[PDB]
Design a protein around this nucleic acid. Sequence first.
RNA 1: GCGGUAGGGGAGCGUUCCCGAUGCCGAUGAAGGCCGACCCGCGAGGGCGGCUGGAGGUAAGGGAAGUGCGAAUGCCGGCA
RNA 2: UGAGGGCGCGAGCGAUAACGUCCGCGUCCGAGCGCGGGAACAACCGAGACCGCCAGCUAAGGCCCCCAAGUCUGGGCUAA
RNA 3: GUACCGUGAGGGAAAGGUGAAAAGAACCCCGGGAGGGGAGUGAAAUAGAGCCUGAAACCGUGGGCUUACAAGCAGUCACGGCCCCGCAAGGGGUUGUGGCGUGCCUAUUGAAGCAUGAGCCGGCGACUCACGGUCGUGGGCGAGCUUAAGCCGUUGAGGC
Lengths: 112, 137, 52, 101, 117
Amino acid sequence: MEAKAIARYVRISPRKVRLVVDLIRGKSLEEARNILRYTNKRGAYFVAKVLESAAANAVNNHDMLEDRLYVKAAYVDEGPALKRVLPRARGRADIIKKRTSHITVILGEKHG
Amino acid sequence: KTYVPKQVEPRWVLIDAEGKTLGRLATKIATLLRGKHRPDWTPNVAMGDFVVVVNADKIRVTGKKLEQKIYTRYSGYPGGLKKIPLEKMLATHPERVLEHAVKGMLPKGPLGRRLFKRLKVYAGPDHPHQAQRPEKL
Amino acid sequence: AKHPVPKKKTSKARRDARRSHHALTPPILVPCPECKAMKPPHTVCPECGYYA
Amino acid sequence: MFAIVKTGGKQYRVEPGLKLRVEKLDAEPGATVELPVLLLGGEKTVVGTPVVEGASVVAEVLGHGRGKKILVSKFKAKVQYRRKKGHRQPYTELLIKEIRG
Amino acid sequence: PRAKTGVVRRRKHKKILKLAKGYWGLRSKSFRKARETLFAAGNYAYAHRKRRKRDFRRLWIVRINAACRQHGLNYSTFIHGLKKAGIEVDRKNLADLAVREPQVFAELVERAKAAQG
RNA sequence: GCGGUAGGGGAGCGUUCCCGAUGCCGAUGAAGGCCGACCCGCGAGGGCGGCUGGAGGUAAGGGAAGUGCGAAUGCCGGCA
RNA sequence: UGAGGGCGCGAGCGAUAACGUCCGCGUCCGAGCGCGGGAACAACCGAGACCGCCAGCUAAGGCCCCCAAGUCUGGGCUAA
RNA sequence: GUACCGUGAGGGAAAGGUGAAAAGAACCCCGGGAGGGGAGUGAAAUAGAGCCUGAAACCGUGGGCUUACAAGCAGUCACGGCCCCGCAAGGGGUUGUGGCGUGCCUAUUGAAGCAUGAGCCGGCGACUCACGGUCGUGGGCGAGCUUAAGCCGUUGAGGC
Ligand SMILES: [Mg+2]
Ligand SMILES: [Mg+2]
Ligand SMILES: [Mg+2]
Ligand SMILES: [Mg+2]
Ligand SMILES: [Mg+2]
Ligand SMILES: [Mg+2]
Ligand SMILES: [Mg+2]
Ligand SMILES: [Mg+2]
Ligand SMILES: [Mg+2]
Ligand SMILES: [Mg+2]
Ligand SMILES: [Mg+2]
Ligand SMILES: [Mg+2]
Ligand SMILES: [Mg+2]
Ligand SMILES: [Mg+2]
Ligand SMILES: [Mg+2]
Ligand SMILES: [Mg+2]
Ligand SMILES: [Mg+2]
Ligand SMILES: [Mg+2]
Ligand SMILES: [Mg+2]
Ligand SMILES: [Mg+2]
Ligand SMILES: [Mg+2]
Ligand SMILES: [Mg+2]
Ligand SMILES: [Mg+2]
Ligand SMILES: [Mg+2]
Ligand SMILES: [Mg+2]
Ligand SMILES: [Mg+2]
Ligand SMILES: [Mg+2]
Ligand SMILES: [Mg+2]
Ligand SMILES: [Mg+2]
Ligand SMILES: [Mg+2]
Ligand SMILES: [Mg+2]
Ligand SMILES: [Mg+2]
Ligand SMILES: [Mg+2]
Ligand SMILES: [Mg+2]
Ligand SMILES: [Mg+2]
Ligand SMILES: [Mg+2]
Ligand SMILES: [Mg+2]
Ligand SMILES: [Mg+2]
Ligand SMILES: [Mg+2]
Ligand SMILES: [Mg+2]
Ligand SMILES: [Mg+2]
Ligand SMILES: [Mg+2]
Ligand SMILES: [Mg+2]
Ligand SMILES: [Mg+2]
Ligand SMILES: [Mg+2]
Ligand SMILES: [Mg+2]
Ligand SMILES: [Mg+2]
Ligand SMILES: [Mg+2]
Ligand SMILES: [Mg+2]
Ligand SMILES: [Mg+2]
Ligand SMILES: [Mg+2]
Ligand SMILES: [Mg+2]
Ligand SMILES: [Mg+2]
Ligand SMILES: [Mg+2]
Ligand SMILES: [Mg+2]
Ligand SMILES: [Mg+2]
Ligand SMILES: [Mg+2]
Ligand SMILES: [Mg+2]
Ligand SMILES: [Mg+2]
Ligand SMILES: [Mg+2]
Ligand SMILES: [Mg+2]
Ligand SMILES: [Mg+2]
Ligand SMILES: [Mg+2]
Ligand SMILES: [Mg+2]
Ligand SMILES: [Mg+2]
Ligand SMILES: [Mg+2]
Ligand SMILES: [Mg+2]
Ligand SMILES: [Mg+2]
Ligand SMILES: [Mg+2]
Ligand SMILES: [Mg+2]
Ligand SMILES: [Mg+2]
Ligand SMILES: [Mg+2]
Ligand SMILES: [Mg+2]
Ligand SMILES: [Mg+2]
Ligand SMILES: [Mg+2]
Ligand SMILES: [Mg+2]
Ligand SMILES: [Mg+2]
Ligand SMILES: [Mg+2]
Ligand SMILES: [Mg+2]
Ligand SMILES: [Mg+2]
Ligand SMILES: [Mg+2]
Ligand SMILES: [Mg+2]
Ligand SMILES: [Mg+2]
Ligand SMILES: [Mg+2]
Ligand SMILES: [Mg+2]
Ligand SMILES: [Mg+2]
Ligand SMILES: [Mg+2]
Ligand SMILES: [Mg+2]
Ligand SMILES: [Mg+2]
Ligand SMILES: [Mg+2]
Ligand SMILES: [Mg+2]
Ligand SMILES: [Mg+2]
Ligand SMILES: [Mg+2]
Ligand SMILES: [Mg+2]
Ligand SMILES: [Mg+2]
Ligand SMILES: [Mg+2]
Ligand SMILES: [Mg+2]
Ligand SMILES: [Mg+2]
Ligand SMILES: [Mg+2]
Ligand SMILES: [Mg+2]
Ligand SMILES: [Mg+2]
Ligand SMILES: [Mg+2]
Ligand SMILES: [Mg+2]
């Protein structure tokens, strides 16, 4: 069986966190835990959190053995970004885009 | 539906170059490189003969060509246009002229470079004796 | 706006081709002598201690 | 035995008994139609005078049919000229049998 | 009575886009680039529908000339003799007998030779 | 007999709306959407099949137009 | 529709210059940047494309290799 | 006639949609929350709350095919390999080699032009109507043809 978990509407650029999501893709739970634990990135926080919550969902709702689950799949999409007005020289005014991202991690049983 | 030739078999050949004129010999050689001599002709697969040339330094050529023909070659640098007469070309590596003459007559596409690889030239004679040494003239 | 400007929209293929090297490397770790937990080499870490 | 028939304005080679696609021939949907047009033979029969004067080949008109659509599309720029036609060159599938030349 | 653009403009577009698939880049995603490239493709197709003839004629001719040169004469002598022999046979293509059944090809070589002159 | 710009002529396709409508089609699933290598027409296009969707749709024959977009440094929005 | 243009031919203007200019007769492009040759080359050579064929014959141009077809036959010339 | 703009007169917007009923998701779980995973309600939760239907650009994940000696308006024709639907023959996807190939619209004597316009997608967008002419045209009548305002009627009923 597989077990999903999704943290949506995370106030952070998707492309940025994707670098982190790609670093744990197809890994052991322990492996991913360590990697995210010692990753120098900001996305590490949110990705690891939705990861842990994912494992929790897996064991408590899909009775898998934690001792052998892994990152079956993982990805991140773009949420409705936030446009913000931004001043500039000679009266010109450009708008900034405080983007956002939906992070998704799914796990599964070891082997059979 | 026209015949589609299956997996071919290579065919090595031995060709002399003593007394042979540059142009004509090079032309027949080029014709032999492609499979144009064989009724299984197919322009998109290339399956001609492994042409081998020996005694390249013995190639004839008419007129004051020896002293008058000039081989040009250019590097990206300014004034980098180098040019060497056929006399000095025969002074150093001689087969270079047969190779030039043949390549210049090959199809510009990649398979042309393939056919060019399938072409062996020396001036000894002797060669990779290998297996096949079928002489023609 | 002023002086230099991209003459053409960069193709997505070209863009990602640029992004080729952006990938991250996993942090290098070694198991510590004290606990079972992972440590980054030549550094001490909590849930542990040291000698001398 | 090898055989060369010339029908539909075109010359096909033919084995004894094989399915073939030829230009539409005005005949019954499933009868017999000898092709008096025939050249050469299996054991060599060079057709000196254009057609061999003493040979033939028999075939059954298996069925009529239409070819798959080929879009023709002319377009000359600068003068907004565009033309688009559909097309299906019809045909009959001949089934070859006896090679009684 | 008002009539918006409605379904129409989409449908049409979609249709053209259906042909566009297989093309590189925006040229297969964007309707406009798709249209242009489809035009050029249509013209190329129509032209190459005439190119196919020339191409196959040439291939055949080369093969014929080769196998014919195996016997001693060139393609010009071959066709001269063959057309002079009365054999309007063999739409040049069917000289594929160079490949399979080359003996028949050889007898044809003779029949062309003697009738040539 | 049939290259074809400006241009003239002929024949058609689709959109909305009315008569045909106290009708006929629609939960055994309307309109719209996604998919197709199938059917028909030279073509605009019509039809069938699978999926989605959830309350409308409108024959044959006629009628009337806010009726067909790829460009206007076009307009609005979305996104690179 | 009333900016036309190139080429050949007959003149003016210019300088028996111009991808110059202004007329006259014809031609082709324009509207044939559709097709084969002229390496590429709107108007020079060939030639007026309704559609399909992996049929045939010709045109200009060519028939040593790139590149399809004669290193064809017979007879002279040229040594650059 | 609000937000917002302008000292002022004035300018001037966007923004409608759960479901029959809120039955608006208790309780457990991860989490600081946000957000989810069960469970439950419901015909449907791919109706989960700016929530019916969810198109295109655009961004991602997995898969099939493919590429690191190759010169390209990105296509096309040909054969071949790998992959896939099908008894059959055939067909779909991809692209290896080979032949060929100077974007679209516009403005032009002439464009592939180093002339103009378009980043991309979706929606809005341009030959109408009124009266009066003019030829053609389908009909009614014909040395005649036709009424206008109005009145009567009706409430898509026409008549005088
Ligand atoms: Mg990956
Ligand atoms: Mg943070
Ligand atoms: Mg085929
Ligand atoms: Mg010489
Ligand atoms: Mg070199
Ligand atoms: Mg190429
Ligand atoms: Mg070599
Ligand atoms: Mg990618
Ligand atoms: Mg230490
Ligand atoms: Mg008939
Ligand atoms: Mg019968
Ligand atoms: Mg124009
Ligand atoms: Mg025009
Ligand atoms: Mg419109
Ligand atoms: Mg493709
Ligand atoms: Mg031919
Ligand atoms: Mg005409
Ligand atoms: Mg016409
Ligand atoms: Mg015009
Ligand atoms: Mg309406
Ligand atoms: Mg009504
Ligand atoms: Mg009604
Ligand atoms: Mg129901
Ligand atoms: Mg019912
Ligand atoms: Mg039913
Ligand atoms: Mg249904
Ligand atoms: Mg349903
Ligand atoms: Mg409607
Ligand atoms: Mg409708
Ligand atoms: Mg539907
Ligand atoms: Mg019709
Ligand atoms: Mg269709
Ligand atoms: Mg259809
Ligand atoms: Mg349907
Ligand atoms: Mg209702
Ligand atoms: Mg109607
Ligand atoms: Mg437009
Ligand atoms: Mg536009
Ligand atoms: Mg915009
Ligand atoms: Mg931006
Ligand atoms: Mg005037
Ligand atoms: Mg004038
Ligand atoms: Mg002028
Ligand atoms: Mg004038
Ligand atoms: Mg004129
Ligand atoms: Mg003139
Ligand atoms: Mg002309
Ligand atoms: Mg003009
Ligand atoms: Mg003309
Ligand atoms: Mg041309
Ligand atoms: Mg040319
Ligand atoms: Mg030409
Ligand atoms: Mg020349
Ligand atoms: Mg020249
Ligand atoms: Mg001439
Ligand atoms: Mg047709
Ligand atoms: Mg003739
Ligand atoms: Mg000449
Ligand atoms: Mg001639
Ligand atoms: Mg010669
Ligand atoms: Mg000679
Ligand atoms: Mg000679
Ligand atoms: Mg001679
Ligand atoms: Mg405010
Ligand atoms: Mg002011
Ligand atoms: Mg105020
Ligand atoms: Mg406004
Ligand atoms: Mg409701
Ligand atoms: Mg919940
Ligand atoms: Mg706090
Ligand atoms: Mg339901
Ligand atoms: Mg249902
Ligand atoms: Mg709410
Ligand atoms: Mg609704
Ligand atoms: Mg929705
Ligand atoms: Mg959605
Ligand atoms: Mg979507
Ligand atoms: Mg491979
Ligand atoms: Mg090299
Ligand atoms: Mg090229
Ligand atoms: Mg593979
Ligand atoms: Mg290709
Ligand atoms: Mg390859
Ligand atoms: Mg190619
Ligand atoms: Mg103007
Ligand atoms: Mg210029
Ligand atoms: Mg300018
Ligand atoms: Mg201008
Ligand atoms: Mg423009
Ligand atoms: Mg611009
Ligand atoms: Mg534009
Ligand atoms: Mg737009
Ligand atoms: Mg008008
Ligand atoms: Mg008038
Ligand atoms: Mg008049
Ligand atoms: Mg009329
Ligand atoms: Mg009447
Ligand atoms: Mg009348
Ligand atoms: Mg009358
Ligand atoms: Mg009045
Ligand atoms: Mg009046
Ligand atoms: Mg009244
Ligand atoms: Mg009443």
